[PDB]
């Protein structure tokens, strides 16, 4: 109690809110819409199965289009899957007599900028060049900091006429700059697709892919051979599913 007060009445049902009407379409159970305390509680309880990768800039060599370039160029990514070459390619101009060797062209260049570092690419999708630098403050101190404060990682900043007395600012009626849901709502606002919003339709229980989050990230640290092979093969299934819209 007192930490999961909004969701405990209905988290463990067969269908959670099929009977109630202010949260769900009906008992046909085809649309949902949540209040933000319920929603922030569902965000907080689901730390082990959500994306803590909230930046979109993390998927630099790891997109769908990056893997499409790795497939189309016979080319491996360290976290990425390996494929057959789409083109069997064999054999004065680009010989070592005429090549200044300064930068050894790693394959991450050939997947990053695919038309520059590849002589003869084709069937190559144009990769998503970067998002801006996401400077998201994580607020990870034990529910002790307010929603608006000066983070320890933030750099410091080294820098008659009269009016009526009752001339007030706008929103001068309220004192509170933040609310008891503001530290939760701002954390919800930067979350990825399942938690980024407070209404939606019902994506079925077999179509809410929960482990798909885990191999679309990098492997964490020092996992053995068979687990990195598992990440690589599940990415291979993912990219063979995304190359072919049926």
């Amino acid at each position: 109690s007192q930490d999961d007060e909004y969701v405990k009445d209905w988290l463990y049902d067969s269908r959670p809110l099929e009977e109630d009407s202010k949260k769900v379409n009906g008992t046909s159970y085809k649309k949902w819409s949540f209040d933000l305390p319920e929603m922030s509680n569902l965000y907080r309880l689901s730390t082990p199965l959500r994306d803590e990768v909230t930046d979109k800039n993390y998927y630099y060599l790891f997109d769908k289009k990056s893997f499409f370039n790795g497939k189309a160029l016979n080319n491996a990514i360290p976290g990425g899957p390996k494929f057959e070459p789409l083109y069997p390619r064999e054999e004065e101009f680009n010989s070592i007599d005429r090549v200044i060797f300064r930068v050894p062209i790693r394959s991450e260049y050939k997947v990053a900028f695919p038309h520059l570092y590849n002589s003869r690419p084709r069937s190559v999708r144009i990769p998503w060049y970067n998002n801006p630098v996401s400077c998201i403050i994580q607020n990870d101190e034990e529910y002790d900091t307010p929603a608006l404060f000066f983070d320890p990682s933030l750099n410091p900043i080294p820098h008659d006429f009269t009016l009526p007395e009752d001339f007030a600012p706008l929103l001068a009626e309220e004192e509170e700059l933040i609310l008891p849901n503001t530290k939760d709502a701002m954390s919800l606002y930067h979350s990825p697709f399942p938690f980024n919003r407070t209404k939606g339709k019902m994506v079925r229980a077999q179509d809410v892919a929960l482990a798909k989050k885990w191999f679309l990230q990098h492997p964490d640290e020092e996992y053995p051979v068979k687990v990195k092979v598992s990440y690589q093969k599940l990415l291979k299934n993912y990219v063979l599913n995304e190359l072919h819209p049926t």
């Binding site: 930490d3 999961d4 907080r44 309880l45 730390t47 082990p48 803590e52 990870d140 034990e142 529910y143």
Partner: peptide, 29 residues
């Protein structure tokens, strides 16, 4: 560092074992 959820060391919030609040192992194989 340590865990934001429980305060214990070793693991992060994505792999904590207590519910988010605002030892012996079958081994030697």
């Amino acid at each position: 560092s340590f865990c934001r959820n429980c305060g214990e060391a070793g693991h992060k919030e994505k792999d904590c074992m207590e519910k988010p609040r605002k030892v012996l192992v079958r081994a030697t194989d």
